[PDB]
Every structure is written in structure tokens, then in C-alpha cells.
């Protein structure tokens, strides 16, 4: 059983690059507790459209932090093959835990 977490602003290149930790610890490894999605945390930003008085008419921005979770139950180094340095993220962060 090994714990890694994966955060990200981008929803597509997480399920992708964490089905990369699926396959690169499936090919070279064994049994998997699959990718489970923690709920997302949306940071809202609401701003009036104008430089000056126009208190109505505003625009709406969000910063959704998608969270995806992946653990696997064979802590071997015949898994940390690709999981050494075989990288296609870009702006994903990783939390390898025990």
C-alpha cells in the first residue's frame, strides 16, 4: 500500500497523467486501488466589469483545484521503474506519502 496524491487546475491532464501512474505501476507492479476523485475546491472571484462606478454588471471567475487520489498495494522497486523519471505532467503537483 503506497499513498500518492495529485492536485491540479487542469481536469484533463490529471486523469491522464494519473492513469500514467495507473499503467506504469500496473505493467510493472500488480494490484491497484484505482484513481479516486476527491471533491474539487472552487475559489470564486467576483469583480465589477468597470474601472469606475457600475456596481451591477460584474464578471465571474473561478479557480477550481481538482483533486485526484491514487494508491497501490505492492511497494516494490520493480514499480519505481518509470516512476523514477518518466515524466509527462506540466503543472501537476505530487504528494508521495507513506
Amino acid at each position: 500500500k503506497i499513498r500518492i496524491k495529485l492536485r491540479g487546475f487542469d481536469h484533463k491532464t490529471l486523469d491522464a497523467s494519473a492513469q500514467k501512474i495507473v499503467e506504469a505501476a500496473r505493467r510493472s507492479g500488480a494490484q491497484v486501488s484505482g484513481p479516486i476523485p476527491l471533491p474539487t475546491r472552487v475559489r470564486r472571484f467576483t469583480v465589477i466589469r468597470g474601472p469606475f462606478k457600475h456596481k451591477d454588471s460584474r464578471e465571474h471567475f473561478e479557480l477550481r483545484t481538482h483533486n485526484r487520489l491514487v494508491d497501490i498495494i505492492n511497494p516494490n522497486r520493480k514499480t519505481i521503474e518509470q516512476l523514477m523519471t518518466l515524466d509527462l505532467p506540466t503543472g501537476v503537483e505530487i504528494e508521495i506519502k507513506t
Partner: peptide, 13 residues
């Protein structure tokens, strides 16, 4: 945010 120079910041709908 409109340029795109603000990462992951989307047009909220």
C-alpha cells in the same frame, strides 16, 4: 484573466 496569463482561472458559469 482574459489574456490567459492567470493559470487555471476560468470564466465562471
Amino acid at each position: 484573466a482574459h489574456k490567459g496569463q492567470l493559470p487555471g482561472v476560468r470564466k465562471a458559469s
